[PDB]
Design an enzyme around this catalytic site. Structure first.
Site, PDB file in Angstrom:
ATOM      1  N   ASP A   1     -33.596  -8.207  31.548  1.00  0.00           N
ATOM      2  CA  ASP A   1     -33.204  -7.025  32.298  1.00  0.00           C
ATOM      3  C   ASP A   1     -33.934  -5.794  31.774  1.00  0.00           C
ATOM      4  OD1 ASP A   1     -31.480  -9.030  33.273  1.00  0.00           O
ATOM      5  OD2 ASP A   1     -29.725  -7.662  33.433  1.00  0.00           O
TER       6      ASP A   1
ATOM      7  N   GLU B   1     -22.883 -15.071  25.284  1.00  0.00           N
ATOM      8  CA  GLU B   1     -24.074 -14.737  26.048  1.00  0.00           C
ATOM      9  C   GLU B   1     -25.290 -14.535  25.137  1.00  0.00           C
ATOM     10  OE1 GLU B   1     -23.220 -11.545  28.840  1.00  0.00           O
ATOM     11  OE2 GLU B   1     -25.248 -11.602  29.658  1.00  0.00           O
TER      12      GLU B   1
HETATM   13  N1  LIG Z   1     -14.988  -6.562  30.339  1.00  0.00           N
HETATM   14  N2  LIG Z   1     -15.508  -7.297  31.459  1.00  0.00           N
HETATM   15  N3  LIG Z   1     -16.873  -7.642  31.267  1.00  0.00           N
HETATM   16  C1  LIG Z   1     -17.804  -7.844  32.403  1.00  0.00           C
HETATM   17  C2  LIG Z   1     -19.208  -7.787  32.185  1.00  0.00           C
HETATM   18  C3  LIG Z   1     -20.113  -7.975  33.262  1.00  0.00           C
HETATM   19  C4  LIG Z   1     -19.627  -8.242  34.584  1.00  0.00           C
HETATM   20  N4  LIG Z   1     -20.626  -8.448  35.741  1.00  0.00           N
HETATM   21  C5  LIG Z   1     -22.036  -8.883  35.527  1.00  0.00           C
HETATM   22  C6  LIG Z   1     -22.819  -9.124  36.844  1.00  0.00           C
HETATM   23  C7  LIG Z   1     -24.324  -9.555  36.583  1.00  0.00           C
HETATM   24  C8  LIG Z   1     -24.449 -10.736  35.535  1.00  0.00           C
HETATM   25  C9  LIG Z   1     -25.859 -10.908  34.932  1.00  0.00           C
HETATM   26  C10 LIG Z   1     -25.952 -11.939  33.669  1.00  0.00           C
HETATM   27  N5  LIG Z   1     -27.085 -12.305  33.443  1.00  0.00           N
HETATM   28  C11 LIG Z   1     -27.991 -11.215  33.061  1.00  0.00           C
HETATM   29  C12 LIG Z   1     -29.226 -11.836  32.409  1.00  0.00           C
HETATM   30  O1  LIG Z   1     -30.128 -10.811  31.898  1.00  0.00           O
HETATM   31  C13 LIG Z   1     -29.922 -12.572  33.427  1.00  0.00           C
HETATM   32  O2  LIG Z   1     -31.230 -13.051  32.882  1.00  0.00           O
HETATM   33  C14 LIG Z   1     -29.046 -13.652  33.872  1.00  0.00           C
HETATM   34  O3  LIG Z   1     -29.742 -14.492  34.800  1.00  0.00           O
HETATM   35  C15 LIG Z   1     -27.735 -13.101  34.466  1.00  0.00           C
HETATM   36  C16 LIG Z   1     -26.819 -14.338  34.837  1.00  0.00           C
HETATM   37  O4  LIG Z   1     -26.574 -15.083  33.659  1.00  0.00           O
HETATM   38  C17 LIG Z   1     -18.233  -8.313  34.818  1.00  0.00           C
HETATM   39  N6  LIG Z   1     -17.696  -8.597  36.193  1.00  0.00           N
HETATM   40  O5  LIG Z   1     -16.394  -9.040  36.377  1.00  0.00           O
HETATM   41  O6  LIG Z   1     -18.501  -8.427  37.344  1.00  0.00           O
HETATM   42  C18 LIG Z   1     -17.322  -8.104  33.718  1.00  0.00           C
END
Ligand SMILES: [N-]=[N+]=Nc1ccc(NCCCCCCN2C[C@H](O)[C@@H](O)[C@H](O)[C@H]2CO)c([N+](=O)[O-])c1
Length: 765
Positions: A538, A735
């Site tokens: 990212d 993660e």
């Molecule tokens: N407290 N609470 N905590 C949270 C914290 C986040 C969150 N939403 C996150 C939506 C985008 C997710 C992206 C993850 N990764 C990024 C990585 O850089 C990529 O390379 C990879 O592919 C993707 C997938 O793994 C929510 N929520 O409920 O939406 C609650």
């Protein structure tokens, strides 16, 4: 025979607990069909149950942990849930019983044990919620003998085109049922299992919590209306017990209240299978599944030294079961901007401002419906398909059950549009969308993601060259079957290849750029000042400012990955004209990796940009990106470049922490800045690629054999131990891991490519 294996696969995989977004529920791999889900919560007051009730997955202080102890989608498994808020340790066992023509039967046991802290006389409300979507289908609760509810089992009889005739039974169960001596018991019963049968328009049946609460609220309104008040109130648990009203509908709510420990069964009997499923069947089938799971694990994931101990085995089983247990079936419309606004070409300086303007037109619209069968990174936080994640997810899954993995690859590829684009984030249906702010739903047809799914394909190919047991490997054991699968997939792989070269092209010709090839040059679309989401990394630092002249060495390397795959698969199908073109592309990427991306000054690869003065500048930020040609298997085992890369990897002052490789160097000006997502933390997916490439060099004659062997040995050790240590202490896969402290950070339940650790322990790449 390929048609036969395919049918046997369909029938095998049709049912499962394929709603990983909720603690426990079932649905078949059919868009519009029968779904179930579990809810429970303690009730201590007139107002608490709305706060205590559990349904959709979360992770906060009220929940110690949860996950699958054992799982195989063909057989079922056992999940355990450790709930602090509701003082309850829960077990949900699910098992499949093959037979009939409609994808077989299944059973589940829900067991709840109060923990030591809970009041021994806790009242716990438990709900089994059942819905059925479809125009010409029926489902009916057989009415009770007794007048206010059920003394014994609840039988739902239903039918549909998809499933034929079936019955779904919720058993009486075991445990104390509280009894009320209140006046209300004259109209509502002393306390018993109840059923409400309802109909809503099909598209909202997924909204189980609101649907249930609407019923609870009407019950309370009836109390108020009928002079049940605070002068003399019925107990909370009776106030929250629905009036029994079984019948026909597309929603059936089955509610029980228990005092102290409880358990009950759910028995789904496919009529076309003959004899119906019993509880003794459930028990036997549950014991059998475990034995089988045990025997497969020991064979497929034989953990090498120094991880052979039972502690590491338990660890492996937990990481693996959570990954494969995340498998979901998703269905519905998704949200896409199909404007192809010319601002999305990103051809000008300042392109990010233009692209923002285009997005502000909001031309996005729902399209589909689509279906996807996929594992997911995160049950609690993002329970849905991500394109480059799935590449990593399937590496261990493929070992376990190659036919499953191929099934999932196929599912992903069936999403690909006419241009060759698959959205990198699959948000299918209103249910899926409910977890996602609207600003973040829209997919963009110019957004790529790494084609890591090719890595799984590569593994299948090498395996192909060299009852449920049979099916799990039918596509390698019958080379006929395998080849036909690649034959059918091959055109889409090529389509995707071409789409990358068409949409993610970099600019050699418009600049003072010299290179072996005029063709080979790549730039991820969709970058903003601080981000490049489409690359997967990212906030890894990139040329500033972003610029249409940029080139990204990770993206070129991915293109190299695909072309090598296309060579192997082409060569398998005798697509000679294709294999000759791929060969020349590969040759060119090899030279251009050096010509455009190698820094002799710095001793690694770098992205490139265009100067304030219109000249090609390298922009080096020592980290994962720097290693890409190595990570992606592109360098010869005797490359002097590779050897410099080995020095960078091993260098404690740059990349090498006790806990794994740092995403960015401690020397880099951007170390630990901003959100610090990819700017230092240790990430298991990239570390897994390092480990695999080190091992490759280590098991071959060359000048770096012994250097690789040392780094492989240590890195495997460091990565496994960090993830194990965190699991031991927190119960969770994380993660990413902190290179200073070794602590897991960001989100938990990341299974998730963190689970690659099972394969790292397994070794023999
Ligand atoms: N407290 N609470 N905590 C949270 C914290 C986040 C969150 N939403 C996150 C939506 C985008 C997710 C992206 C993850 N990764 C990024 C990585 O850089 C990529 O390379 C990879 O592919 C993707 C997938 O793994 C929510 N929520 O409920 O939406 C609650």
């Amino acid at each position: 025979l390929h048609s036969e294996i395919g049918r046997l696969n369909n029938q095998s995989l049709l049912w499962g607990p394929y709603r990983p977004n909720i603690y426990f529920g079932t649905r078949p791999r059919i868009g519009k069909s029968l779904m179930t889900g579990l809810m429970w919560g303690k009730i201590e007051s007139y107002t608490d149950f709305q706060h205590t009730v559990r349904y959709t997955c979360e992770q906060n202080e009220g929940m110690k942990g949860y996950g699958w102890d054992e799982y195989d989608p063909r057989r079922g498994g056992i999940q355990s849930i450790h709930d602090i808020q509701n003082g309850l340790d829960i077990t949900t066992s699910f098992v499949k019983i093959p037979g009939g023509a409609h994808g077989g039967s299944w059973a589940a046991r829900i067991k709840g044990t109060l923990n030591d802290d809970a009041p021994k006389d806790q009242k716990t409300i438990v709900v089994f919620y059942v819905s059925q979507e479809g125009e010409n289908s029926e489902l009916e609760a057989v009415p009770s003998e007794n007048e206010f509810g059920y003394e014994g089992d609840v039988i739902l009889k239903g039918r549909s085109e998809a499933l034929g005739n079936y019955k779904l039974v919720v058993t009486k169960g075991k445990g104390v049922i509280p009894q009320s001596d209140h006046d209300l018991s004259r109209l509502r019963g002393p306390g018993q299992t109840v059923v409400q049968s309802l109909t809503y328009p099909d598209e909202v049946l997924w909204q189980a919590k609101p649907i249930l609460f609407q019923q609870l609220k009407a019950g309370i309104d009836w109390l108020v209306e009928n002079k049940y008040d605070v002068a003399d109130p019925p107990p909370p648990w009776q106030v929250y017990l629905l009036a029994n009203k079984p019948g026909s509908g597309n929603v059936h709510i089955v509610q029980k209240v228990f005092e102290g420990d409880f358990e009950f069964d759910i028995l789904f009997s496919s009529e076309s299978a003959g004899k119906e499923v019993t509880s003794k069947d459930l028990e036997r089938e549950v014991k059998q599944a475990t034995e089988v799971f045990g025997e497969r694990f020991a064979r497929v994931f034989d953990l090498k030294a120094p991880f052979q101990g039972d502690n590491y085995k338990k660890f492996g089983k937990s990481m693996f079961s959570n990954l494969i247990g995340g498998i979901g079936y998703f269905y519905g419309h998704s949200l896409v901007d199909r404007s192809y606004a010319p601002e999305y070409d990103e051809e000008n300086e300042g392109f990010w401002e233009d692209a923002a303007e285009a997005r502000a037109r909001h031309q996005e619209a729902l399209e589909g419906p689509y279906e996807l069968f996929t594992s997911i990174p995160s049950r609690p936080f993002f329970p849905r398909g991500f394109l480059w994640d799935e590449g990593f997810h399937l590496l261990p899954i493929a070992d376990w059950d190659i036919d499953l993995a191929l099934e999932i690859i196929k599912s992903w590829y069936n999403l690909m549009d006419e241009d060759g684009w698959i959205a990198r984030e699959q948000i299918l249906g209103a249910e899926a969308r409910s977890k996602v702010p609207k600003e973040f739903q829209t997919q963009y047809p110019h957004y790529a993601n790494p084609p890591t799914l090719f890595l799984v394909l590569d593994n299948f190919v090498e395996r192909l060259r060299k009852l449920d047991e049979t099916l799990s490997t039918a596509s390698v054991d019958n080379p006929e079957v395998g080849l036909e699968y690649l034959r059918r997939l091959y055109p889409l792989l090529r389509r995707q290849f071409d789409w990358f070269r068409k949409t993610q092209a970099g600019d050699i010709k418009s600049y003072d750029r010299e290179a072996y090839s005029t063709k080979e040059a790549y730039r991820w679309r969709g970058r903003t000042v601080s981000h490049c989401l489409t690359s997967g990394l990212d906030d890894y630092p990139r040329p500033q400012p972003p610029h249409p002249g940029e080139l990204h060495v990770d993206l070129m390397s991915w293109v190299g990955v695909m072309v090598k795959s296309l060579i192997s698969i082409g060569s398998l199908l005798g697509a000679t004209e294709d294999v000759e073109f791929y060969t020349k592309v590969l040759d060119a990427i090899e030279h251009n990796l050096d010509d455009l991306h190698w820094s002799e000054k710095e001793g690694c690869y770098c992205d490139a940009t265009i100067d304030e003065f219109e000249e090609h500048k390298l922009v080096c930020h020592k980290g994962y990106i720097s290693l890409f040609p190595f990570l992606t298997g592109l360098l010869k085992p005797d490359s002097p470049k590779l050897g410099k890369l080995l020095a960078l990897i091993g260098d404690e002052s740059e990349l090498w922490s006790p806990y794994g490789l740092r995403s960015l160097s401690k020397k880099d000006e951007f170390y630990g800045t901003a959100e610090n997502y990819w700017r230092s933390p240790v990430w298991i997916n990239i570390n897994y690629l390092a480990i695999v490439q080190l091992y490759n060099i280590a098991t071959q004659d060359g000048p770096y054999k012994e250097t690789a062997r040392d780094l492989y040995t240590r890195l495997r050790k460091n990565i496994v131990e960090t993830v194990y240590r965190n699991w031991e202490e927190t119960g969770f896969a994380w993660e990413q891991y902190n290179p200073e402290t070794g602590k897991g950070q960001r989100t938990q339940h990341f299974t998730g490519w963190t689970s690659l650790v099972v394969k790292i322990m397994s070794g023999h790449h």
